[PDB]
Design a protein around this ligand. Structure first.
Ligand SMILES: [Cl-]
Length: 127
């Protein structure tokens, strides 16, 4: 599915992301916009043989297991296929582990480059 902006904001808030580990809700909404264009089925292959999966483009080298990525660590203990559900639960649960690992939201390249330093609360304004 393709979420609307406020639709995703509300779902992410229900799933506990607002202010999680220091990151206000707008950060997460902006990240999803630029990572997946709000599409729960987005996938992108990388040079290292990994793939990024779902609404938050979770990577198959470190975080989820897709069975085809060399050096897999599966630190979220989740099959990547679950991260292509239209229900965001598994992606949120893994994102919480990622953002707790010690480098904040820097794991998300699109957030680092296109969200960080901007007024991210604009992404939840009007909702
Ligand atoms: Cl604005």
């Amino acid at each position: 599915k393709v979420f609307g902006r406020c639709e995703l904001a509300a779902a992410m808030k229900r799933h506990g992301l607002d202010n999680y580990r220091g990151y206000s809700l707008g950060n997460w909404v902006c990240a999803a916009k630029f990572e997946s264009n709000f599409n729960t089925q987005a996938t992108n292959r990388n040079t290292d043989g990994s793939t990024d999966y779902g609404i938050l483009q979770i990577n198959s080298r470190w975080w989820c297991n897709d069975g085809r990525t060399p050096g897999s660590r599966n630190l979220c203990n989740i099959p990547c296929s679950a991260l292509l559900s239209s229900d965001i639960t598994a992606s949120v649960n893994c994102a919480k582990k990622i953002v707790s690992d010690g480098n904040g939201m820097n794991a998300w390249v699109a957030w680092r480059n296109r969200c960080k330093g901007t007024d991210v609360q604009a992404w939840i304004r009007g909702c």
